[model samples]
Target: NLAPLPPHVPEHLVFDFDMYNPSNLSAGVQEAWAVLQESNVPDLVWTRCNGGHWIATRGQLIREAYEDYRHFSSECPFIPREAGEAYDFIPTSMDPPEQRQFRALANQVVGMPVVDKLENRIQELACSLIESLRPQGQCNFTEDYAEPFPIRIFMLLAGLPEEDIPHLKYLTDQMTRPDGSMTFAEAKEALYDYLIPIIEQRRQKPGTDAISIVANGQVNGRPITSDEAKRMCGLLLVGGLDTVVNFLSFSMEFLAKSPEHRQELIERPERIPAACEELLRRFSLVADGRILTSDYEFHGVQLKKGDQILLPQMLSGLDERENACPMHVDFSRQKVSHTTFGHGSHLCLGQHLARREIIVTLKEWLTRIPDFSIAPGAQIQHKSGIVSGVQALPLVWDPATTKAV
Candidate 1:
């Protein structure tokens, strides 16, 4: 039982917002979403920016849309209708049945069991990276640790050469936040071009790596097509490269300013797991939405058919109605609820891998250099779109406080 639009919403709200700008505001990712939330906008409202679409600001609405596949289609999942049509992939863009098979195939390679196998390597690499930076007393944290650490692990999992990272990471960044060097279509097409060959190479002869695993696996009991393989690989690349990079900086920035929070982790290292959950809730780094399949009405608002809807996985936990003092980070807070890894069938498959990486960083870094702060007079800037993050994180500390083994 769906309903058509009532009368007020005009057709003009469909244009996509210009997400990229020279001045992305001094506010961070969470703050930028806060800008949208404070408006008391409808659960579903159109925006003229980026081929305007409806947005779901609360966690409940976002989760409901994600679960209700019939009303909210993931087929053309991205905003700017054209982009979603062009950016189809396994699991993410594919609805259930077809989607589930690919999801199962994908889990075989990057899931929890695979992550547990890689735990030692993850910890070793984290320690090695931090050991190099701790003695220096100051560092550009985003570039040094945040970006490279996870991307390198991803490359290792894919069994790709380290040399390809620079090119790949650049293209991935463009899809999320275009750098003025390429249009949305151009960047996406370029990524597909790069992935197509990799898909073929792996399909022809499978190997011990992640890409090969997907290439060789079956979807619906038949071998996965080269195109499907390419899209899945591409999604893995984007998810693996961007999510952790933004998250690390966001968490560390807070830890630098809030010693009480950092000290809690230092004294009770076991709490790092809980601390990770709190950080993910407080600072969700990604914002994506889907298009409504048909006209619908909810909470007395009419949502027209074919309109786009933005579901920011970051906003709901911030609602004061849901959590008292929603803005404050409480590592000890009970019943922490969030859609950080996402909701529904498209939830992040690589999340276990990500958690291991984040937990290791928290445990290892505080064990070594327990005290650090944003470098004096250095302005930390943040950018938004798809994934939001710090442009740079300059941190400084006293070397003597570092413990040596």
Candidate 2:
């Protein structure tokens, strides 16, 4: 199950930590990864877990690696090497001047302007979904609310039929958190196969939908190609289907357990925004890496050319050096810092939409069902990979305590 240790890797520095199925993952996904940052663990340790790679266990090194894209290339961002080579998402896959042009078009689609335009619908949908679930004292929050709320909105924005969700979402999940059902290349090819037709149809007759816009829109000074549009739209689909969808379950799951934490947000509703940031810090769940372009010495450790280093965006937020009591959720924390949305030129373009979704869900859900907790005797399980997620969240509450708001 473990790859043979690379000859260049020092014996003391080897820490066989598998990103796919970590040994310490039994406690919690975040807790499982936090073991890499313990006192004795070096800031940078080579893990023989995922076919051998370096892991930046602290915030300082993670940020430095992300910022220095010249040395740390985004060409192969994912682990297991093959998936990274196959990861062809625009902007995320490209770097610098080339990456910047595509980002402008991506921003136009999911940026603040689009979020503001979708504001009323975002609020309306959140209220409607929560209200429908209010009467029921028990519900599978993951399937009932978490999946539909954000994904439906994205489906509408992209002009895709609601029925297409299952197929599309399956492919996207494979690229991020594979279940060994398919390889990343196979998953990506399937996604492209689905998008190629849609992209072509949109090109013939454009609409106000996100896909249509990207298909017909221009990047830099020229119009985008079908292949380019398919690639870009594929990234958008992954962002829409994955990021906030999983984040919602994690946030709601945390609220289900922490009564005092819930009370803080309920008593002072205005603090919801601050609480959003802190929660994003505490429950941050995204980890990605960069491929080394050439052999070089970094932080006193020698890294070889083509060696993959997992500069976890999730770990940076959890690092105590960047945040005191990093595990605790403190809405009142004066300075909360994190790279949950990622860092550098490759920072997430859809973050504004993601934030709006999180804040709206928090405010709306709590307003309706102020008191809720995990179902009796139910255990919450988390899945980890490029992006971590909750497997399910079964919540229960008193019908008398719920409001029809």
Candidate 3:
């Protein structure tokens, strides 16, 4: 189903590809989106679905649009117009200079410095989880590790209890991939409800946890209010609970099928970091974009004010112009360019922690279960939205080949 094409949109630019439910989605989510880049599709095209928004189909345009934040404002960054209007994730939703101060405060919590603080725990947790599953011979990687591994590590850093993963994860999931159980506004409200009390309590009795630090931290030389803290903390919660979860799932799915790729890493253990970069580039996910600030002429197309354009962060690396054989996971690409962690000042802050998690998963899991495949007869399907995701990924391995560390 498509929305009525707006009169201002040129008929030649219309390409009704739905972001949430792409035509090729059943085959693969990434490929589904890659349809936008098909030879015939313009670099910038308008889709009637999700209330008629523009989509930058190639990498150059995606990066350019993201960098020119003044025109392509992050004010309403979600598709379907309403979600973007409802989105209020502090720094991510705010644009430019004002957004900068909040970002500095957020960096202190989940940035590179924080990763070092949690390094030992991050590695140990990965090893411990893999070691426990070593003898099992098979497991649902999505449920058994993908969800728990990072979620636990994040919970540890956030100073939140482990038991709350079920609720927190669900709300975050809704914000990105709505199952229609609730609206985006509803999801955001519930998340704030969960944080309001916590933020207040943290402000009163601050801990060394991420929440306490942000709740009491200074932004622009002044104390951040409770309202601001909840907004920032809510964004952090979503970043922790969701993004990496799907990336890991999509990555394991690829590794499970490509033994040669696995062999490359297994043979050259030192290449884990390089392989991590390549994998991040190959399976880059997260498709949120900016809303048009005003009628602006860009890349030979005219975008009207209030028109939404989804510049998929996932598509940047996949552009053949940016990466040769964009679909293949070549582990040794010379220049792995991407907006995967995002671009500009608002580039994803959790990238450091995310990279650490992926590297740990690859190095540790391959050490224990070097040979594993998707469970026999089980097909994998993905969910698409602001953040792309996979359903349960059941992986099987022979215990005979596994090692106990």
**C-alpha local distance difference test of each model:** 0.80, 0.92, 0.91
Candidate 3 lDDT, 1-405, residue by residue in tens: 778888888999999888888889988899899888789989999898888899998899999988998999999999878899999998989999789999889999999988998999999999999999999998898899999999999999999999999999999999999999989999999999999999999999999999999999999899999999999999999999998889999999999989998998889989999998998888888998998889999987888998888999999999998999999888778899888998876888899999999999999999999999999999899889999989889999999999887
lDDT order of candidates, best first? 2, 3, 1
Cα-lDDT of candidate 3: 0.91
My TM-score estimates for the predictions, one after another, are 0.93, 0.99, 0.99
* Candidate 3 similarity to native, TM-score: 0.99
Poorest 10 consecutive residues by lDDT, candidate 1? 15-24
Off by over 4 Å in 3: none
At residue 212, candidate 1 shows an lDDT of 94
Prediction-by-prediction clash tally: 13, 0, 0
Worst 10 residues of 2 by lDDT: 19-28
In candidate 2, position 216 carries an lDDT of: 93
Residue-level lDDT for 62 in candidate 3: 91
Give the alpha carbon lDDT tens digit for every residue of 304-389 in model 1.
78777778777777766567777899999997888888899888888898888899899999999899999999888888777888
lDDT for model 1: 0.80
